[PDB]
Design a protein around this ligand. Structure first.
Ligand SMILES: Nc1ncnc2c1ncn2[C@@H]1O[C@H](COP(=O)(O)OP(=O)(O)CP(=O)(O)O)[C@@H](O)[C@H]1O
Ligand SMILES: Nc1ncnc2c1ncn2[C@@H]1O[C@H](COP(=O)(O)OP(=O)(O)CP(=O)(O)O)[C@@H](O)[C@H]1O
Lengths: 323, 323
């Protein structure tokens, strides 16, 4: 039942500036700035797509190994994940680079100044999935989450070499890759995850028809925001599941990651496609209603009640029975 | 022999941008920016004036208590200091704020974009030195390092209330305080530390003559950069000690902090004024030759050799004998 999650591991360091960046920028010597912002607030969120997905799977009680690259400063993040049941044995720790970091300061008019530090992320290309297979045996599924582009290809190729079922998450990189590069991420996939816009892009760029893709993959999962999700089998059967109604639209960061994690946890727990997408939808709404990506809580009774409200008591009982 | 160090506790998070900020700034919508810098490097240095001074005293084998405000994220920094002999029992840990942070990105033309997050620093005004006195007895000296302005005043007043000898470090705040406010930081001091420019400023702003100050304090210590240091007693005796010659001018950050720490360690170890300033000068040059402020090493044999080279074998033997 073990899901190996590959992809980025990062933290986000977010600061609030009470004033207006413009008031410092407008008079500036733009050819050699010396800007100093006195900030009000500092919030740190654990993130990266692989971290977010591993977190959610762990919290739901699934079997999960996080497989990605970080720095020695990953230690607290490791502790946080291990407490939620996440196997971190196969996180590569860089000798030289820190864990990837996104730092952003936002002003009162929502202007933003950000830095992205990739750090240890490009070292994911040095991970061997054969090492995971030696230690814990063949994972039930390997998620190919957004990552260092080369690492995404190497992990996908290795899944083929080792006979591991993999999930193609081509999203973030579709706009940046050639059609031929995209094809190589998709061929032989157990699952393909994209949103609706990305799905149309994937087809256009690859020169593939839908029929072409469905002969390459076992299930297309296409998310539709508030319109729910489509699950399409190679036989032409389609299942559409609507969302769990939100009470807050607070923070849409990490909502796609959480859907995937909940859906795949469902699958590993033996749930069918519809029940799995219903669970995915619940995890997604809980992330939507939380600031950050791993700041949400799992309340068994509340989950049961919310699933019942969205999908009926029968669906809810069947879903909760697998935790 | 216990020195209680009050003042700021912080970390510095420094990033390098390979390109030019101008190339992103010049075309920008300055009224609502959305800047994203892909950075090359991330270096974190432990800092704050109290942290730097406590570190140096600890490393030299002196008895030291760090007395300042930080956040729960101070834990690793605490571990780092405790390993160097620093008592951290009386660091106030905020319930709500993180440890103060300076974050700075520098481009290829040395343009800079920085944020300062004060965080837990204003909570230093809630520290009671009477709590230190209960736990470890009366410190031999309390350093009033640059801090939250109100905390500097409250700590100085409490030193008077409790009968504790204190060191006035009025530097960073001289330009910002009234003459009357400056007087209140100076009255009754065991030591006054400033540089030469700051000394002239202090006099002008307070309306005090030198004679006026020397009737308030037990020793004026005035640092002169590469020209060394003056030590002036209330009797009119002056001792000038020249610097230990540098082999690198790498990073002048923290050099004033290190001089103070080395000098005061000397004093607590029973060394006279000249020998103490000779030790201070060595610690200062070691910081000058290191990037950051607590990244330097203490090598007993190397110290002895360098002190001998600057000040003679007799001076060196007397200095090293107290570690
Ligand atoms: N307003 C809303 N209320 C409840 N659930 C929602 C929602 N919007 C999205 N979701 C859930 O999250 C899933 C994925 O969201 P979406 O289709 O926006 O993917 P995405 O990849 O565009 C998000 P990201 O910006 O994180 O990449 C949806 O299928 C749905 O289950
Ligand atoms: N070029 C140099 N070589 C060796 N030692 C030096 C030096 N410059 C300064 N020092 C040492 O450090 C001491 C304090 O330096 P300085 O007089 O620059 O204080 P300051 O308060 O201006 C530094 P800061 O910018 O950290 O506040 C000097 O008295 C000297 O012992």
């Amino acid at each position: 039942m073990t899901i190996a999650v590959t992809g980025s591991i990062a933290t986000d360091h977010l600061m609030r500036f009470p004033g207006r960046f413009s008031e410092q920028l407008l008079p500036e010597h733009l050819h050699k700035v010396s800007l100093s912002f006195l900030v009000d607030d500092l919030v740190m969120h654990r993130g990266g797509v692989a971290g977010n997905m591993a977190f959610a799977i762990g919290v739901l009680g699934g079997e999960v190994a996080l497989v990605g690259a970080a720095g020695a400063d990953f230690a607290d993040y490791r502790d946080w994940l291990k407490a939620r049941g996440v196997n971190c044995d196969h996180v590569l720790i860089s000798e030289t680079a820190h864990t990837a970091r996104f730092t952003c300061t936002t002003d009162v008019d929502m202007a933003q100044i950000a830095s992205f530090y990739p750090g240890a992320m490009s070292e994911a290309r040095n991970i061997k999935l054969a090492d995971v297979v030696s230690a814990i045996g063949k994972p039930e599924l390997v998620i190919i989450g957004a990552n260092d582009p080369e690492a995404m290809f190497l992990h996908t190729e290795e899944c083929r070499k080792l006979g591991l079922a993999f999930a193609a998450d081509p999203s973030q990189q579709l706009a940046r890759l050639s059609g031929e590069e995209i094809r190589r991420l998709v061929n032989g996939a157990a699952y393909l995850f994209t949103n609706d816009y990305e799905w149309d892009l994937l087809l256009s760029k690859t020169g593939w028809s839908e029929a072409d893709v469905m002969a390459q993959i076992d299930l297309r999962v296409t998310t539709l925001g508030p319109k729910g999700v489509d699950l399409v089998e190679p036989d032409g059967t389609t299942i559409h599941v609507g969302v769990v109604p939100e009470t807050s639209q607070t923070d849409p960061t990490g909502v796609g990651d959480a859907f995937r994690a909940g859906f795949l946890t469902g699958r590993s727990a033996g749930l069918g496609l519809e029940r799995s997408a219903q669970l995915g939808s619940l995890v997604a709404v809980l992330v939507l209603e939380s600031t950050g990506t791993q700041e949400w809580q799992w309340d068994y009774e509340a989950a049961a009640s919310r699933l019942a409200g969205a999908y009926g008591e029968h669906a809810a009982a069947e879903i909760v029975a697998v935790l």
